[PDB]
Amino acid sequence: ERIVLVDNKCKCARITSRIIRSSEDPNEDIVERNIRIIVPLNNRENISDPTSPLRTRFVYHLSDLCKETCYTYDRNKCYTAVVPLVYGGETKMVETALTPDACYPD
């Protein structure tokens, strides 16, 4: 029986807990808080704006996410950044999708 305390989707923290049960006796059960953080290793300060360089710092405040920028992309919401595309002398300002198969129109 694993209970999920909090879960920040775009940070991918997944703070969970479970009470392991030993033989019946005066209480010696080990309470544990189990987290599973997926570091990107390739994302930027903005995951949407390509101009920002690679981010080395990886900040994970547990209390801040239990209750802004983050590292992991989401599969539900869209990340759209404005991008310039030029054909000839003039230019047209167009949208783009940073990641594929995430929130394509249906």
Binding site: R14, R18, N27, T99
Partner: protein
């Protein structure tokens, strides 16, 4: 014929969502069909006594001016004069009661391990500090199930040592050890003013207690944006 005015507790308007006025009169002489005047600044009369004991073996006939009024009227700070009209007193005396702001600092503390080692029972406390109004009520609730009033007891208001204006109170729902260690949910709620919302729900469990083990699972994978 004693003269004294007692204000109803602010916990009454949260427990029953109503206000019940009461005048503190002790050992008034038993007389048939007594009348009591409880006048506010408007001077309106008070509704008659309800559920009173006309005959008392100890002759303690308390004169209670029971009535139902809105909380706005009492919160306005109006002067409340208890005119104790009686045959014995030709000129009744007047007694006045009135009330002249920080959010409650409420946190729930897990029980000690020594109590669990003793196996007799378990005691959990709910610390309510940092509140300027004198009165405060704490209710204990397990998954929406009300309890007996005598199982949990609240403490009298005492001045905070750091700040004389602030007050502190401790509330306990003492329980058995088995109900604690099987993971049954315990919630603490406070009914106090000077708060953004009406009540704040606070809970603690064995799982959400002191954790001994920590297996963080940080996967350094080039794949990103999938979870």
């Amino acid at each position: 014929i004693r003269v004294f005015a007692i204000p109803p507790s602010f916990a009454s308007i949260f427990l029953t969502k109503s206000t019940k006025l009461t005048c503190l009169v002790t050992d008034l002489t038993t007389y048939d069909s007594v009348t009591i005047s409880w006048t506010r600044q408007n001077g309106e009369a008070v509704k008659t006594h309800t559920n009173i004991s006309e005959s008392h073996p100890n002759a303690t006939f308390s004169a209670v001016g029971e009535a139902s009024i809105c909380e706005d009227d009492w919160n306005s700070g109006e002067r409340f004069t208890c005119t104790v009209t009686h045959t014995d007193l030709p000129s009744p005396l007047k007694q006045t009661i009135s009330r002249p702001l920080h959010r409650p600092d409420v946190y729930l503390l897990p029980p000690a391990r020594e109590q669990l080692n003793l196996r007799e029972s378990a005691t959990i406390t709910c610390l309510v500090t940092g509140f300027s109004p004198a009165d405060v009520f704490v209710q204990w609730m397990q998954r929406g199930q009300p309890l007996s009033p005598e199982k949990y007891v609240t403490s009298a208001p005492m001045p905070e040592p750091q700040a004389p204006g602030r007050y502190f109170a401790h509330s306990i729902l003492t329980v058995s050890e088995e109900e604690w260690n099987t993971g049954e949910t315990y919630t603490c709620v406070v009914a106090h003013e000077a708060l953004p919302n009406r009540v704040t729900e606070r809970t603690v469990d064995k799982s959400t207690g002191k954790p001994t083990l920590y297996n963080v699972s940080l996967v350094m994978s080039d794949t990103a944006g999938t979870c």
